[PDB]
Symmetry: C4
Subunit: 191 residues, 4 copies
C-alpha cells in the first residue's frame, strides 16, 4: 500500500504520541462509522459527536440529520459501568487517536501464537498488540494494543445513551487466561 | 493517496488559478455526475453540456443519448433566481474548476469548530473552507471554499431547465448565523 | 494514478509501436471482456481466442469452458463485410495492442470540440484521438485514435461467428460530417 | 500496481525462498479464503488453522466462530489419497508461501502457448509457471509453478475433514499430454 497516513489508536482517554520521525497531522477520537478500516485516516475524527451532520432543504431551513441516530467508536480499556451512559459522560470511555505522516510503508504481521512476531530485518517496531479482524490483516488497523472482549461502543443520538456493541461480523484471531488464546501482532515500518 | 491531480472548484463564474508550483492541466466546469468525489479529475469537465453523449446503432444512424436527461453540477455563490432557468442562461450559475499537477500529497483537515484547523508543520495551506460530506473526509473534495445551503443544481436536458437540487444523502459537518455552525477545513500540501 | 503500464490500441491489424523511451512488455489483441478499461493491461491479450478457458472436474476429466460462449473485442478501421464472419477469418478485423513501460504518468485530456486539446506545458503528446466513454475520462482508454460508429465486435464461441456489437451503455463524447460532432482528445505524458 | 509485497507459493510442503534482493517479511500457508488474489499478502497465513476466529458476546463468554466452518487452501503437488483426510493429517498437502519485500514492480506475462513468454528487456525472471485465472492476469497470482487439475482443497472445521475442491468459477488459460494445452507464464521484475 501507499498509506502515507498511519493511524494510532490509544484505547485510553489520552492522545497517543506519533512515533519519532513522523509529523502529527491531527488528533481526535477513534471512530468506526456512523449509521471501516481502523488503519485509515477516516477512523480518526477530530471532535467526538453523536450527531455530526446537518441537512439543508432548498431554502433557509437547515436541520440536524436525526434519522440514522447510531454511531460506533473504539472504547478505552477502562470498564464501562453496568448501566448505559449518557452521551455527555461518554468521552472518558472513547479511545483517542492520532494521524501520523509515515515516510515509509507500515505493515502488521501476525503470529497466531502467544509469541510476538518479529519485524523483518531493517524494519522498526511501532507497536505490539492483539490480532483483530473486522467485516486487511496486513493493515495496521488489525493490530490493537489492548485486547477487549467487546472493543466497541454504540451510541444513540436520539436516545442520548451509549453502551457496548456486539458485532456479528468482527472477530479476534486465535492461537493455533483469555488473552493467552488471542493471536499477537506487531506493526512494523521499513527504514 | 497518490492523487497527483488536485481539483480546485471556484464556486464562481471565474476559473480558479492553480497554486504556484503546479501546472494547470485543464480547466472547465464543476460536474458532480450525469444520470463522485469533487476531489477527482472527473469532477472537472472542459465544457458545460447537459447532453454530452452520443449513441450509435449498428450502421450510420447515430443519435444523442436522451433517456437519462439529468445532470448535476456545483453552483456558484451568486443566488439562482426564484424561477427555473433555461439551459442557455445557466452557465453564470455553474462553478468553474481547474485541475493542477500537484508534486506532493494534499489532504483536507477538519476542525468541527468555527476555528480553521492548522496545517501540519512544514505543510503549505492551499485553501480554507467548510466541511462537506457526500454519499473521504481526508480528500480535498470535502472542503469547499463557500458554504451554500443547496450547493448543487440539477438540469433537465429534455426539459431544457435547471434549478437547485435537494440531495438526500450529502451533508455538512457541524460544530460540536448559520455559517457559525458549520465545521471549517483547510486543504494542506506537504513540501 | 500509478499506471506504469500504458496500453496502446492500433485499431488496425498491425501491432502498434511503443513510444520512444518505453519498453514493450508484450503485444497482442484488443480485448474488452469475456462473458473493462481499455487503458488497463488486461485489455491486451497475447493471442486471439474465442474459447480461452479450461475447466477441470475433480479427476483427469478436463473440458473447455463452453457455457459463457461470448467474447468482445475492439475492431479495426477496416469495414466488416455485410454478413457474419467465421472465427477463423476474424483476426484481420480485431485491433492489435501493445503494453508499454511508462516511466511517468499519462492522462487523457478532452476538448468537447473539433480542436485537439493541448498537452500541459512540459508534457509530451503520445497520441490524439476521439473521446470514448464506457460503462475514467482521465484514463488513456477513453482516447481512441479512430472513430468508429460501432467500435466493437462480439464473437460466439459455440456459434463460431462474429459481428459488430451494439453496446447499450458506452457512448462517444460530443462537441458542445459525423466525426465533426465527436469530442477530440490527446493522451499526454509528463517528462 | 504498487505491490511492494510479492507472494510466492511453493505448491510443496517446503517454505519457498524469497528471491535474492528481497527481505522475507513472513512465511506460512497458502490460503484462498475462509467462508482472493493469490498475489496479495492475505493469501499467506502464518499458521494453518481451519477455525482461526473467536467471537465474544457482551461479557466474559467468548466462543470459537463455528457457523461458517469452511476454509479453502492451495494444495501441494503430492497427490491427496482417495479418501477424505482428517484436519490433523492435512498439513503435508497444504502449499507453503513466503511474503517478500519487492523493491520494484513485478508482473505476470502469459503466452497462451507451450512456450514460456520472455521477460521484457532489463527485467529479471522470478519464476515460470502455468496460467491460472480465478473469479488480474497481470498479477503474479495468476502464475502457479505447477499445474494441478484441482489445485485447491476444502476443509470442514466442524466435520474435521478435507478434500479437493471443484471451483465453478476459476479456470486455466489454454493454448491457442494435458499440460501441453495449458498456457505458460513467467513472473518478471524490473531492475
Amino acid at each position: 500500500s501507499i498509506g502515507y497516513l498511519l493511524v494510532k489508536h490509544s484505547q485510553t482517554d489520552q492522545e497517543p504520541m506519533c512515533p519519532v520521525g513522523m509529523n502529527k497531522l491531527w488528533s481526535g477520537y477513534s471512530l468506526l462509522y456512523f449509521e471501516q478500516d481502523l488503519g485509515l485516516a477516516g477512523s480518526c475524527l477530530a471532535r467526538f459527536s453523536t450527531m455530526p451532520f446537518l441537512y439543508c432543504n432548498p431554502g433557509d431551513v437547515c436541520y440536524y440529520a436525526s434519522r440514522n441516530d447510531k454511531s460506533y467508536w473504539l472504547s478505552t480499556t477502562a470498564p464501562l459501568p453496568m448501566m448505559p451512559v449518557a452521551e455527555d459522560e461518554i468521552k472518558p470511555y472513547i479511545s483517542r487517536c492520532s494521524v501520523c505522516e509515515a515516510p515509509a510503508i507500515a505493515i502488521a504481521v501476525h503470529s497466531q501464537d502467544v509469541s510476538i512476531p518479529h519485524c523483518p530485518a531493517g524494519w522498526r517496531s511501532l507497536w505490539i498488540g492483539y490480532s483483530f479482524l473486522m467485516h486487511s490483516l496486513v493493515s495496521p488497523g488489525s493490530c490493537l494494543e489492548d485486547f477487549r472482549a467487546t472493543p466497541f461502543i454504540e451510541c444513540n443520538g436520539g436516545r442520548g445513551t451509549c453502551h457496548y456493541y456486539a458485532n456479528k461480523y468482527s472477530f479476534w484471531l486465535t492461537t493455533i487466561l483469555i488473552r493467552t488464546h488471542i493471536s499477537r501482532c506487531q506493526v512494523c515500518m521499513k527504514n
